[PDB]
Design a protein around this nucleic acid. Structure first.
Length: 87
RNA sequence: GUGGCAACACUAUAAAUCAAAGCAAUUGGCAGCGAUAGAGAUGCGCGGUGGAAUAUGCUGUUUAAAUCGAAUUUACGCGCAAAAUCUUACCACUUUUU
C-alpha cells in the first residue's frame, strides 16, 4: 500500500495534535507522555517517531492501554487490540 | 342316581355376570406360500471416502457476543449465488423517540 499514499491515521492524528500542546514527542528523547491517548479506531497505521505514547485502543468492549516502543513503528494499531480468545 | 377293578363313562342343571361373544363373502396390511415382468438390484468393472494437509460446514469448549434456524435417513460447500466497516439481527459504550 506504500504506492499512491501509504499512511492513514486521521483521528489518531487529531488526538496526537491534542497531545502536541507542549511537545509531540518530548521535544521539551522520550519520557512516556503520561497524558493517556485513547483512540476509538484501530484501522490506523503507525507513523515513524510516535514513540513513548500511551495508546488506549478499542477492542469492542473497552479501551486497551499499551505503551509503544521502537519495534512497533511499521505496524497498523489493530494488531494490538485482540478479542482475547486465549483458550 | 346307575356301571366298574378303576382311571372315571354317563344322566344333569344352574347359580352369577356381560352387551356383545359370533358367522359368510369380501376390500385393504402382512408371506417365514409360488409362477410371470422391471431396476450397475447385486456377484460383473471403474473411481472415490475413511490415511496426510488445506478449504469448507456441524457439534462441543470458552468468550462480552461467537446472532438465529436446518438435526437419522432427505442436516452438515444448509438458509449464505459470498461477513474487511456496511451486509447484521449479537455484544461493549454513548445518545435518541414513544
Amino acid at each position: 500500500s506504500t504506492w499512491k499514499g501509504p499512511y492513514v491515521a486521521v483521528s489518531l492524528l487529531q488526538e496526537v495534535v491534542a497531545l502536541a500542546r507542549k511537545h509531540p514527542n518530548w521535544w521539551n528523547i522520550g519520557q512516556k507522555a503520561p497524558e493517556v491517548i485513547n483512540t476509538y479506531s484501530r484501522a490506523s497505521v503507525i507513523l515513524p517517531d510516535f514513540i513513548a505514547c500511551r495508546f488506549g485502543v478499542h477492542n469492542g468492549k473497552s479501551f486497551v492501554g499499551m505503551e509503544v516502543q521502537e519495534a512497533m513503528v511499521g505496524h497498523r494499531l489493530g494488531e494490538f487490540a485482540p478479542t482475547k480468545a486465549t483458550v
